[PDB]
Write a protein that binds this DNA or RNA. Structure first.
Ligand SMILES: Nc1nc2c(ncn2[C@H]2C[C@H](O)[C@@H](COP(=O)(O)OP(=O)(O)OP(=O)(O)O)O2)c(=O)[nH]1
Ligand SMILES: [Ca+2]
Ligand SMILES: [Mg+2]
Length: 430
DNA sequence: ATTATGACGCT
DNA sequence: AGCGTCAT
């Protein structure tokens, strides 16, 4: 009843760039604009591996993780842009720099949490309070929400998609009580007005389009963002959660798309997120642990408390390369040459990071995979990172991994290495 | 032969 | 610390 917390205390948005690496390449090369196109890494093996796909290309069935040769079967006119290669490996600097462009615009509106190269959470609670005091009880025009969908609407008592969007928005706005400055629905709506402005600023100042979700917490904002892509934003109200969750597969909620989600489905004999409401908090804790159980109990009612962390910069800077099948490294000189390549890219990125962001990494993490292990990482070892020097970094990494070499022979490396990974961590202000 | 990252939880 | 999970 009156004491039952409803998780409506915050306004949280999630801004995700549409087909991000494709947009970066389309900005640079106008011949790729408004075309089926994809971004690929490498080329010799099966035409390269697709990592981003324009919405035009998605209509043909092209997806991430597909080999370009196979994508070309589905979409013979598909256009491809390749990720840059430097020191023998994929170099993602262009996309990281474009990400910084977007993140700096977003930071003008509110403190953001960088969730990935192309996605940021926004805590809009304070900005909404401010804009509400400016509004002075003035209603919110549909003209201020030109790309907003209201999830669950229209309902009750119409052919095209834009008309449907507008019908739902008008139902939502007509149900609004603008007199109450603590109405959660009003707060979400003002949040959506702000996100429209943020998205317009991103597109004006970068050329990039994005989608967004607006709700009361990060999980619902992320889910909302996915409902109407591309180039649209979606408001998920607290009241929309029972219907939305009643047919929502558990795997669609962030953090439940892997083994934990599969165990929720198997142990409880359910399919949809809304079915979780029928279990007590103790029951869920008994199956999934104290933390997961409390989180599931609240999540399935639309409640989640994870804060938007004030963090615009990545906490680690890392360099990784796979050496698949027959390209696995089998000589000491090979291992040393590739460690040096990785370390040179890392030194370049670290030196730029130190100049831009007034910080220095203090720990170097070295990870490898050996042929045969089905795990991502076979071994992970840290050492001190005391100087930004690639030869020192690569010598140190070799020192911490050299004992994995089973080969009695000094020159050979056995079993061959199928992955190398260097990561700088534990930053301190400088 | 899916590749290149990145965040966070567990013990 | 080192490993595992999850995301994409
Ligand atoms: N190197 C590499 N980059 C990846 C991989 N998966 C995704 N990315 C990059 C390329 C994407 O453009 C970018 C952002 O990923 P998203 O999941 O947000 O997808 P994207 O923005 O492409 O499409 P969207 O409109 O959000 O569905 O991250 C991967 O496996 N490897
Ligand atoms: Ca995206
Ligand atoms: Mg994203």
């Amino acid at each position: 009843g009156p004491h039952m917390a409803t998780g409506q205390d915050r306004v949280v948005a999630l801004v995700d760039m549409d087909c991000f690496f494709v947009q970066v390449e389309q900005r640079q090369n106008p011949h790729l604009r408004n075309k089926p196109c994809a971004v690929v890494q490498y080329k010799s093996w099966k035409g390269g591996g697709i990592i981003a796909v324009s919405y035009e290309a998605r209509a043909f069935g092209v997806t991430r993780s597909m080999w370009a040769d196979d994508a070309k079967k589905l979409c013979p006119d598909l256009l491809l842009a390749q990720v840059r290669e430097s020191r023998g490996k994929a170099n993602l600097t262009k996309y990281r720099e474009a990400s910084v462009e977007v993140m700096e615009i977003m930071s003008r509106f509110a403190v953001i949490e960088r969730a990935s190269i192309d996605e940021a959470y926004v805590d809009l609670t304070s900005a909404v309070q401010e804009r509400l005091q400016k509004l002075q009880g003035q209603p919110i025009s549909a003209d201020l929400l030109p790309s907003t969908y209201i999830e669950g609407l229209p309902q009750g008592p119409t052919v095209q998609k834009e008309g449907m969007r507008k019908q739902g928005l008008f139902q939502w706005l007509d149900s609004l009580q603008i007199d109450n400055l603590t109405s959660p629905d009003l707060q979400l709506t003002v949040g959506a007005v702000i996100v429209e402005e943020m998205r317009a600023a991103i597109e004006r100042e970068t050329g990039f389009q994005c989608s967004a979700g607006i709700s009361h917490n990060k999980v619902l904002a992320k889910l909302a963002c996915g409902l109407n892509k591309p180039n649209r934003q979606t408001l998920v109200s607290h009241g929309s959660v029972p219907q939305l969750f009643s047919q929502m597969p558990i795997r669609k909620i962030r953090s439940l798309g892997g083994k934990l989600g599969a165990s929720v489905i198997e142990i409880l004999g359910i399919e949809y997120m809304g079915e979780l409401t029928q279990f007590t908090e103790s029951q869920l804790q008994s199956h999934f642990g104290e933390k997961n159980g409390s989180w599931l109990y609240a999540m399935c009612r639309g409640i989640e408390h994870d804060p938007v962390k004030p963090r615009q910069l990545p906490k680690t800077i890392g360099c990784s390369k796979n050496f698949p099948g027959k390209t696995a490294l089998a000589t000491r000189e090979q291992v040393q040459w590739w460690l040096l390549q990785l370390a040179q890219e890392l030194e370049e990125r670290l030196t730029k990071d130190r100049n831009d962001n007034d910080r220095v990494a203090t720990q170097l993490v070295v990870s490898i995979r050996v042929q045969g292990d089905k795990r991502l990482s076979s071994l992970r070892r840290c050492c001190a990172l005391t100087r930004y020097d690639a030869h020192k970094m690569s010598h140190d990494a070799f020192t911490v991994i050299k004992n994995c070499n089973t080969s009695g022979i000094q020159t050979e490396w056995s079993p061959p290495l199928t992955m190398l990974f260097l990561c700088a961590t534990k930053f301190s202000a400088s």
